[PDB]
């Protein structure tokens, strides 16, 4: 688990940037909070759902949900949730008092899809937040996530087309949003495939780095499929990094 | 530079997403609630005419600028 200071630096380092691990197209409000909670929990908590659903996730003892009571002061690093709209809204608190708080957020104005709205620091006079999710920060800075075996390049094979690939036997369960599986090759330029539905799952036997994504390779009804499963930063060696998952592995 | 016509195959108004089947008879296109052009909508109904642009992203083809009829 990471420190309050690292959350502070993360929040400000992302001021003005588009945060899009993908999932939904553009810079949505839940994309920012999902990326943030993933980061400060060193990878242990990947929130699923819409913005309003965030208070329903399993925080694995790494955070407390609080209701917004007229006495409650948000703190730096808290996640502010709006539960009483259709799909909700969510923000990364920077500072708080009893009259207002300030936060980093995406899609407050509705520009996330079109891209003209990026993560922005705004002020809110308690205009709909119903809960605050407080991380249980660690006292020291942590780099667990950055050094994790998942973010360690290790050994990969490579074919003549530049696809890095490995054998791996595990199961992947799709998260909240569907993902389009590609026939025959892990290539976003392959137009054939089918929509892997949320909460569906498959065993898989191969993992690939192709087209800026990590993919799983698996077999289904006589056909070989490749499913994109998270972002890859495009780099090999000690610069290699991959993003938060689009499902759950086991 | 036309926009595709298509049908809301289904939409889950609780979760905020569904699928549109283009007229050109290609891949089912993912539609997300953020892609419906504001104006007090934020929900589409099963089997209704919609016109939209198609964006190809890492997760698959997604519907942009979705408009009723
Ligand atoms: Ca996104």
Swiss-Prot record, chain B:
Domain of life, source organism: Bacteria
Keywords: Activator, Cytoplasm, DNA-binding, Transcription, Transcription regulation
Subcellular location: Cytoplasm
SUPFAM superfamilies per record: Nucleic acid-binding proteins (SSF50249)
Gene Ontology molecular function, alphabetical: nucleic acid binding; protein homodimerization activity; protein-folding chaperone binding; RNA binding; single-stranded DNA binding; transcription antitermination factor activity, RNA binding
Signal peptide, first to last residue: none
InterPro entries xrefs: Cold_shock_CspA (IPR012156), Cold_shock_domain (IPR050181), CSD (IPR011129), CSD_CS (IPR019844), CSP_DNA-bd (IPR002059), NA-bd_OB-fold (IPR012340)
Primary subcellular site in the record, as a coarse category: cytoplasm
Gene Ontology cellular component list: cytosol; membrane
PANTHER family, per database record: COLD SHOCK DOMAIN CONTAINING PROTEINS
This protein's name: Cold shock-like protein CspC
Organism: Escherichia coli (strain K12)
Gene designation: cspC
């Amino acid at each position: 688990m990471k420190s309050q200071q690292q959350a502070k630096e993360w929040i400000y380092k992302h001021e003005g940037t588009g945060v899009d691990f993908d999932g939904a197209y553009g810079f949505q409000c839940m994309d920012l909070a999902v990326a943030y909670v993933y980061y400060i929990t060193d990878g242990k908590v990947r929130m699923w759902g819409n913005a309003k659903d965030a208070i329903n996730n399993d925080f694995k003892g790494l955070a407390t949900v609080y209701e917004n009571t007229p006495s409650f002061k948000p703190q730096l690093g808290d996640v502010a949730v709006y539960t009483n709209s259709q799909y909700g809204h969510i923000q990364c608190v920077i500072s708080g008092n009893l009259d207002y708080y300030t936060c980093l957020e995406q899609n407050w104005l509705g520009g996330g899809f079109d891209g003209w709205e990026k993560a922005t620091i705004r002020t809110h006079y308690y205009d709909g937040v119903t809960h605050f999710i407080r991380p249980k920060f660690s006292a020291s800075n942590s780099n667990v996530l950055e050094t994790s075996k998942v973010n360690t390049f290790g050994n990969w094979k490579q074919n003549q087309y530049g696809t890095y690939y490995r054998n791996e036997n595990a199961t992947f369960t799709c998260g909240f949003l569907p993902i389009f599986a590609r026939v025959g090759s892990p290539k976003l330029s392959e137009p054939n495939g089918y929509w892997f539905q949320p909460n569906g799952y498959t065993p898989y036997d191969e993992v690939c780095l192709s087209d800026g994504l990590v993919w799983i390779g698996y077999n289904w009804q006589g056909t070989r499929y490749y499913l994109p499963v998270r972002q890859w930063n495009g780099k090999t060696g000690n610069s290699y990094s991959i993003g938060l998952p689009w499902g759950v592995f086991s | 530079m036309a926009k595709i016509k298509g049908q809301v195959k289904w939409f889950n108004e609780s979760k905020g997403f569904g699928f549109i089947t283009p007229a050109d008879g290609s891949k089912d296109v993912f539609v997300h609630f953020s892609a419906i052009q504001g104006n007090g909508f934020k929900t589409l109904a099963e089997g209704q005419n919609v016109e939209f642009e198609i964006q190809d992203g890492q997760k698959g083809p997604a519907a942009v600028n979705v408009t009723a009829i």
